[PDB]
């Protein structure tokens, strides 16, 4: 009986260690190293980490007593589930409001539409604020930490930030200061809010 | 024999699940929610997560064969250790250069000295860049994502950013634009670099 439980349990331990190593190598030297295809893998890794801890909680209450002290392990699981469930409905509401498909992001439910040259690019923000900063830094626009590609001082005068419940705000560029070379320090101040 | 291995292994699984839950409740709704005492707990949680994965790797190579396929689990451990070791020496070099005590932070080894009113406040940055942004947002200064407390448009004209190896740069405030109320969009451009 020891052999099969052994094999299964150190297999679980080794896969947990492998996901730990994935997180470590992701965060140590690739935290914001030009997140073009790495932001997506961050998002999906968090998305698959949700069921990892859900599975740990549900498996911690199937191989022990469930009434004296082990019954917490399932009671602690269910709340996570509802949080998980809440996640979806929030994202669903966001996916009901817009059609960006950049929803279902575990970080937050807030969308940033930047109509850069060409089409509009959608990024997930963290919170909605009155003032939004932007930098160029040798022709690489970065608004709120998201690298959006080649750009110059002649930026776009307006960009949208939409929340889920009852918020769709607009930001207008103002006081575009230029730094040596082509680096810039463009601003975005909220001026219009649209409900519903 | 099944009983003691059982108790130990689901105890390990439940403590792993508990640390997962700690990470989830930390990141979901408290990612940047005024990190005054929570940034420190983030740092120490990462610091204690390093030996968590180290222990997982070392324990994955003690209860199985160590020559055919299990010998990876220790060979994968040692590299983490050297990375861990490298961590310390890097921080040590930083702690040799300055005396801020804000080193030993798992994110990066870069210090940001802001001489705000009173004494100088030290924060850990992520990378050294030419342009640094700052916002006020109803009297709450936030430079590069770090909430530094009450402030107005009459900011500090200079702040230091020191790296570890051979870098100690200075930034001067320029083009201080004001937003409705008391919100601001102050800038910081690097102008002097001091080696050694």
């Amino acid at each position, epitope marked *: 009986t020891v052999e099969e439980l052994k094999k299964l349990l150190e297999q679980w331990n080794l896969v947990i260690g492998f996901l730990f190593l994935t997180w470590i190598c992701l965060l140590q030297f690739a935290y914001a190293n030009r997140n073009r295809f790495l932001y997506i893998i961050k998002l999906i890794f968090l998305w698959l980490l949700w069921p990892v801890t859900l599975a740990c909680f549900v498996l911690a209450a199937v191989y022990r007593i469930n009434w004296i002290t082990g019954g917490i392990a399932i009671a602690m699981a269910c709340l996570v589930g509802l949080m998980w469930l809440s996640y979806f409905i929030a994202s669903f509401r966001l996916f009901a409001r817009t059609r960006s498909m950049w929803s279902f992001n575990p970080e937050t439910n807030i969308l940033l539409n930047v109509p850069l040259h060409g089409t509009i690019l959608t990024r997930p923000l963290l919170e909605s604020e009155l003032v939004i900063g932007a930098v160029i830094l040798r022709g690489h626009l970065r608004i709120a930490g998201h690298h959006l590609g080649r750009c110059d001082i002649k930026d776009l005068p*307006k960009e949208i930030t939409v929340a889920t419940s009852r918020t769709l705000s607009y930001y207008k560029l103002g006081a575009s200061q230029r730094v040596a070379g082509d680096s810039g320090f463009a601003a975005y101040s909220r001026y219009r809010i649209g409900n519903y | 024999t099944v009983e003691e291995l059982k108790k130990l292994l689901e105890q390990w699984n439940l403590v792993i699940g508990f640390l997962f839950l700690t990470w989830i409740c930390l990141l979901q709704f408290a990612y940047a929610n005024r990190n005054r005492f929570l940034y420190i707990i983030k740092l120490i949680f990462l610091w204690l997560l390093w030996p968590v994965t180290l222990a997982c790797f070392v324990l994955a190579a003690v209860y199985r064969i160590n020559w055919i396929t299990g010998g990876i689990a220790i060979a994968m451990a040692c590299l983490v250790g050297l990375m861990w070791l490298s961590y310390f020496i890097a921080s040590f070099r930083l702690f040799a250069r300055t005396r801020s005590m804000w080193s030993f932070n798992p994110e990066t080894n870069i210090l940001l000295n802001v001489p705000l009113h009173g004494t100088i406040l030290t924060r850990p940055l992520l990378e050294s860049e030419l342009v640094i942004g700052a916002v006020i947002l109803r009297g709450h200064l936030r430079i590069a994502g770090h909430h530094l407390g009450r402030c107005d448009i009459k900011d500090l004209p200079k702040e230091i950013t020191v790296a570890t190896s051979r870098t100690l740069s200075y930034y001067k405030l320029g083009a201080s634009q004001r*937003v409705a109320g008391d919100s601001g969009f102050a800038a910081y451009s690097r102008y002097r670099i001091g080696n050694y």
Partner: antibody, heavy 113, light 112 residues
Framework: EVQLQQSGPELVKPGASMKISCKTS????????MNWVKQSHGKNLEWIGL????????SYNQKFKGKATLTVDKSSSTAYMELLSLTSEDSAVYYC??????WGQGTLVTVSA | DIVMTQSPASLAVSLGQRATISCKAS??????????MNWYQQKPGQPPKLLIY???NLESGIPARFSGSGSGTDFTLNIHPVEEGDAATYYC?????????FGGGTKLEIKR
């Protein structure tokens, strides 16, 4: 170099429909909310509606809900505001403006037989 | 529903004197912690021209003679150095509730 040109003056009869153009130049057409404003009977200003050139997303007011509709053609970079069931109170100057700073020339509409 | 009634009936000032306009909100227009009041200047025969977009910090390209202030349900537009070339109509817009309604309109007359 944002420039907006409307379809000049107009004269229609009560009970008909009309179209107002908002040809744009100097910027990428997709990206601006393209708000509309109506002014008539002196110097009375009020809001009509906004349409997103990217993908629909029309937002009107209950006063003008059903009275007028907005259509967007991304090829010509022009707006195509459409007015239905005009009446003597609809004789107005219509402005199409993008970001509350670049206003249009203004289209004068007279509804009388 | 949030009809705003600014109450300068007619304003007539000479050169250099202050010109104050007193647009008033309806019930509680201070959404999201601040007021997004917009001020528009419209010369006859010309479309309205924006001066201030959020209650203060006027846009670039406009002389600093225009200033905005106020909060809650009381807003004020101030022009201290009234010069020769400004005799247009001033309007206030809310840009905050379901309708983006404008103000009643105040005519500015230069005394000479």
């Amino acid at each position: 170099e944002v420039q907006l040109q409307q379809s000049g003056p107009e004269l229609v009869k009560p009970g008909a429909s009309m179209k107002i153009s908002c040809k744009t130049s100097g910027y990428s057409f997709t990206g601006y909310t393209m708000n509309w404003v109506k002014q008539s009977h002196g110097k009375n200003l009020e809001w009509i509606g906004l349409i997103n050139p990217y993908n629909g997303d029309t937002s009107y007011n209950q006063k003008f809900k059903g009275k007028a509709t907005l259509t967007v053609d991304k090829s010509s970079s022009t707006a195509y505001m459409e007015l239905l069931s005009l009446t003597s109170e609809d004789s107005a100057v219509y402005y199409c403006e993008v970001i509350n700073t670049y206003w249009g020339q203004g289209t004068l509409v007279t509804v009388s037989a | 529903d949030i009809v705003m009634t600014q109450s300068p009936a007619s304003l007539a000032v000479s050169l250099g004197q202050r010109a104050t306009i007193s647009c008033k909100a309806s019930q509680s227009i201070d959404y999201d912690g601040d007021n997004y009041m917009n001020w528009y200047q419209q010369k006859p025969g010309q479309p309205p021209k924006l001066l201030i977009y959020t209650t203060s910090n006027l846009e670039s390209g406009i002389p600093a003679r225009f200033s905005g202030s106020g909060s809650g349900t009381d807003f004020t537009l101030n022009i201290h150095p009234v010069e020769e070339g400004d005799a247009a109509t001033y309007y206030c817009q809310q840009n905050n509730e379901d309708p983006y309604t404008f103000g009643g309109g105040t005519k500015l007359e230069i005394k000479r």
